[PDB]
Amino acid sequence: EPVYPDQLRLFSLGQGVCGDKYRPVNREEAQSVKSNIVGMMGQWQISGLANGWVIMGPGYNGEIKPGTASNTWCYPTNPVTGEIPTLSALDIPDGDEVDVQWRLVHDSANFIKPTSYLAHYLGYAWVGGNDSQYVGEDMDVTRDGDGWVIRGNNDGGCDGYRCGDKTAIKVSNFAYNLDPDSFKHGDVTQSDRQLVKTVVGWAVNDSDTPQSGYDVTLRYDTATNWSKTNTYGLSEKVTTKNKFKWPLVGETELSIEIAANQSWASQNGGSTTTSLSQSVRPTVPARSKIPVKIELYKADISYPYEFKADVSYDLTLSGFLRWGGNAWYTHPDNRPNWNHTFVIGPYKDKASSIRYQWDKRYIPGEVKWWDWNWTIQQNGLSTMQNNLARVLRPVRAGITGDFSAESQFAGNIEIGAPVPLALRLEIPLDAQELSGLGFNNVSLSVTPA
């Protein structure tokens, strides 16, 4: 009877008020799933719990403490019971696409048996080979065009009505979504921030009046370039759902964008030039000078990389449905030949979503395909739970290669304390030498703030 975080809903209806069919989450309940709630809150959010308590956002370290709030964390007065657990990922090593697929479809404990049992619990007939009396055993895995077919070996004769008609499980339409946030990196091959030049001098206030309200601005443009390799050919088909910026590693500042819906293997490098300007608005007492410095740096970095790409596929179950026991909502008794496609991965529509069908099973108007309550009655709640959690187990392929980047950047303009003379700039800049160091169109200017 745990509290299910994915059933929580926030209401903004006044002190301790919840919407219809919801009730306020109490402190014990909130504690039991604390990190999940906090992880659904804004940094400085503070939300009400029942009986004078409040739970705070991650900026407050997700504290539960007494208080009042106009918004309230709430939970179904009648929650959907026995959710399908989420299991830890199944990690498959980087490889070419065939070898990655092969590794998946030939896994007995993680793929063959779970999908077989699923076909079996749904009412599909003869999910098993002739040389075993158990479901999902003596299965034949064969390549079929761009996909794969799992199906009980059928050699020879067999005993049972229509035992020759073995149910087939076909895996197709593989896709691979790189998860930017799964980023991990090996040991930093090359790394350093080297000082290539320091621009140094003075800014002088010649007047007899404390001068201020004057900006001293350095403008310059530099190039950042980066490259990367892709260890294997799978990367030729992996994409990322949304554009993202390359992770920051080291102090070497970098601006690199990976494009959405573009072959990982097609984004192997680039160079960007950007005009940047930084300034300071110093107060310089009358008839004085202040020292000014600007450090210029070259930075580069190399390191082996690895992301995870979430592997999704369609599971098409085809075979005839057993008499006096199948899970189709009509419960057909004529042994019809049946075909159904589940999408293992990102949701596509209700008909093809085990998770959706499952969570809605107690709503008769939603039961338009499989009758999961029947599967539960026949095999038991935890049996259906453990099987589907294995069927739906996230599968992730590793995406590897080497990364390398190079940039040139200026440090901040730094100033020292005023010295009495014994806004005018005395700060030599050699355009040619700077250009040779990768800093172009460099200027230092004095203008009203």
Author numbering: 2 to 423, 441 to 467
Describing publication, verbatim:
Aerolysin is produced by the human pathogen Aeromonas hydrophila as an inactive precursor called proaerolysin. Conversion of proaerolysin to aerolysin involves proteolytic cleavage of a flexible 43-residue loop near the C-terminus. The protein is L-shaped, composed of a continuous globular N-terminal domain, Domain 1, and an elongated region consisting of three discontinuous structural domains. Domain 4 has no known function but contains the CTP, which is folded as 2 anti-parallel β-strands connected by a short α-helix.
Residue His-132 is required for heptamer formation. Our MD-based observations thus suggest that the CTP remains bound to aerolysin upon proteolytic activation of the protoxin.
